[PDB]
Design a binder for these strands. Sequence first.
DNA 1: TCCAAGCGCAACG
DNA 2: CGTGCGCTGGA
Length: 258
Amino acid sequence: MNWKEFEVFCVTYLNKTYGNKFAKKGESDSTTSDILFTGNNPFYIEAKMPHSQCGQFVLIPNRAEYKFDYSPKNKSEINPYTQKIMQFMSENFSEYANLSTKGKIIPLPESVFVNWIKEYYKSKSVKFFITSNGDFIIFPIEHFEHYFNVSCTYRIKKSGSRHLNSKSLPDFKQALDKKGISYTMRGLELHSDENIHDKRISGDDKDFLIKENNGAYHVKILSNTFNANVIFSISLKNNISLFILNEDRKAFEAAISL
DNA sequence: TCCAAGCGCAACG
DNA sequence: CGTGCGCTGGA
Ligand SMILES: [Ca+2]
């Protein structure tokens, strides 16, 4: 299944096992998780597939000072583990200053990255993670290292898309005309009997992406921002201690009962 | 309202 | 197993 189906799978399990107290609804944002326990001891639960990413921060190369600057637009504050990563990269500036989409791994002790993850998720009121290796695994953030292997890389990650808007509609219609695609627009919704799912077309310094929705196509404008971020990858361990697993399930059962 | 940017997410070539 | 779109400050 994909990650969206996986998150629904996790929420459904929580509600059927522990009662209808686990919300995944409404708007989200990066300062919180996607699943909220709505009891007297509220907290967020992070669902992670066995192979996932697990947080990031943008660093800007300063080629005059030969160091990396923490982006003032990042959404989490510098903690000591952020500082260790930045210090390592800055002391090795030449090796990290040529940004790449392939990325360059950061060979610091895994505990530095685990500690960054713990700090970051604690700061977002994420107290537990849920994953699955065939059975559901729920554990508190303080025991993260017993469940996931962690690595860290610095890579260009292009920023995300935005919905086609009225201001861009003329350029998009003209891009369709240029590409020879037969179409009709109903507001910002695109209609065509051509097979244009995932189609990319460009015009007037905008790269457009076309995706099939219920009965029509939705149009997105892709980004032109190509900054680089430290970003964490996690892989579920094959050898999780059953003793830790059991005490961690009891920790969760305590947390939802306070 | 719109755009740049950062964080969400494993996806997929 | 070695790359970026969907979503959410300030002008
Ligand atoms: Ca990595």
